[PDB]
Amino acid sequence: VNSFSGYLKLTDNVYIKNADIVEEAKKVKPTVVVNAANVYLKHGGGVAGALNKATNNAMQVESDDYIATNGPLKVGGSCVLSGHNLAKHCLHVVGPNVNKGEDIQLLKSAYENFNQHEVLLAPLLSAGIFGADPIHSLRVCVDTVRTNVYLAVFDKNLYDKLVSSFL
Ligand SMILES: CC(C)Oc1ccc(C(=O)Nc2ncnc3[nH]ccc23)c(Br)c1F
């Protein structure tokens, strides 16, 4: 039993809700919140900008030190950093950004990072400003993640479309 509330169950392990991931993280304080990161951990907009804003820019400060030490992530890769006031940990995961021409096949690799964590609060990878089809992202999520994932979808219209079209 966990503290996530109001989710629709899609499969044995995947759950979905129309919610602002920032507000959901603040309420649940999950062990792991997933960020929709880029390889430079520049949290300017989208989910990343919102999460970073909620940490009062502490996420960005920590991220800049991470990059200075380690260099950029790989597309499809991830790193574990602090969750600040939102979660114990933040798993920064880089899905391919279609608006940069990146290979959509890397979306499966990106979701594989979730399997290293028993339970996660997450957005749909490569959705929103990353330019992929969120219906496809949900399909890859369900077919790749085996651990327990609670998906927050900000847009109510998109949420209803994802549910109603789910196979
Ligand atoms: C073309 C348009 C429909 O694309 C999208 C628009 C918005 C979302 C969305 O709800 N994003 C979020 N989800 C959870 N927390 C969040 N905090 C801040 C944003 C946010 C998504 Br997934 C989209 F794909």
UniProtKB/Swiss-Prot annotation:
Result, substituting residue 31 to A: In strain: Mu/B.1.621
Catalytically driven reaction(s): Thiol-dependent hydrolysis of ester, thioester, amide, peptide and isopeptide bonds formed by the C-terminal Gly of ubiquitin (a 76-residue protein attached to proteins as an intracellular targeting signal)
Domain of life of the native organism: Viruses
Record's bilayer topology term: Multi-pass membrane protein
Subcellular location: Host endoplasmic reticulum membrane
Activity regulation (record text): Inhibited in vitro by GRL-0617.
Domain Macro: 1-167
Function: Responsible for the cleavages located at the N-terminus of the replicase polyprotein. Participates together with nsp4 in the assembly of virally-induced cytoplasmic double-membrane vesicles necessary for viral replication. Antagonizes innate immune induction of type I interferon by blocking the phosphorylation, dimerization and subsequent nuclear translocation of host IRF3. Also prevents host NF-kappa-B signaling. In addition, PL-PRO possesses a deubiquitinating/deISGylating activity and processes both 'Lys-48'- and 'Lys-63'-linked polyubiquitin chains from cellular substrates.
Subunit field text: May form homohexamers. Interacts with N protein.
Protein name (Swiss-Prot/TrEMBL): Papain-like protease nsp3
Source organism phylogeny: Viruses, Riboviria, Orthornavirae, Pisuviricota, Pisoniviricetes
